[PDB]
Amino acid sequence: LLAAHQAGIHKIVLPKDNEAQLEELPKEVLEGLEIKLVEDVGEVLEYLLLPEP
Amino acid sequence: LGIPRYRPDKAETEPQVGTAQGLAWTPVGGTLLTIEVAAVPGSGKLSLTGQLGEVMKESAQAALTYLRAHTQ
């Protein structure tokens, strides 16, 4: 996520099971970066497609 | 200690839909392996991945034709 933020990239997709990892951090990280935690690959592929197929 | 890096004792595992959970005996001391299986659509061909021994291939054949004694 820090790689993403320093590149100015702020809207992220991540595994649901990694919801636990999140809290050894400051709000510096946690509020520029807007995390869409998902458990399946159907979920990320609905998020990352611009057009419909 | 921080956040539970697992769930508790494993009645909470809530059965998977096809991956078996095998007992493995390793030089780090015998620890689990959940050997994973993808059943794909196709035409009836086998491939086997994952640094496997050929003993695993043969055991797959043995269980496999055991299944072929039990498709009925």
Side-chain angles (χ1 to χ4, degrees), chain B residues 17-28:
Chain B
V17 287
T19 291
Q21 193 169 6
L23 297 174
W25 53 287
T26 53
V28 301

Side-chain angles (χ1 to χ4, degrees), chain B residues 13-63:
Chain B
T13 307
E14 293 293 321
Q16 296 295 320
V17 287
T19 291
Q21 193 169 6
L23 297 174
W25 53 287
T26 53
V28 301
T31 184
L32 263 70
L33 287 177
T34 71
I35 282 92
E36 301 178 353
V37 169
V40 313
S43 65
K45 310 299 183 181
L46 178 56
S47 172
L48 307 91
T49 67
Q51 289 90 16
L52 68 156
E54 297 181 353
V55 289
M56 319 304 173
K57 302 177 186 176
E58 296 173 355
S59 63
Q61 307 318 111

Side-chain angles (χ1 to χ4, degrees), chain A:
Chain A
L1 285 171
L2 291 160
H5 170 68
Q6 292 180 0
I9 299 173
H10 307 300
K11 293 89 185 173
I12 301 100
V13 174
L14 287 177
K16 172 78 75 64
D17 304 333
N18 289 116
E19 66 173 352
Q21 326 304 104
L22 262 60
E23 315 301 337
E24 308 298 322
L25 305 182
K27 302 296 181 183
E28 308 170 357
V29 177
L30 295 172
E31 288 298 318
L33 305 172
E34 303 161 352
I35 298 168
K36 306 179 181 67
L37 291 165
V38 294
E39 70 186 5
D40 294 327
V41 177
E43 295 161 342
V44 53
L45 296 189
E46 289 192 2
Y47 295 179
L48 264 291
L49 264 291
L50 160 68
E52 290 78 3

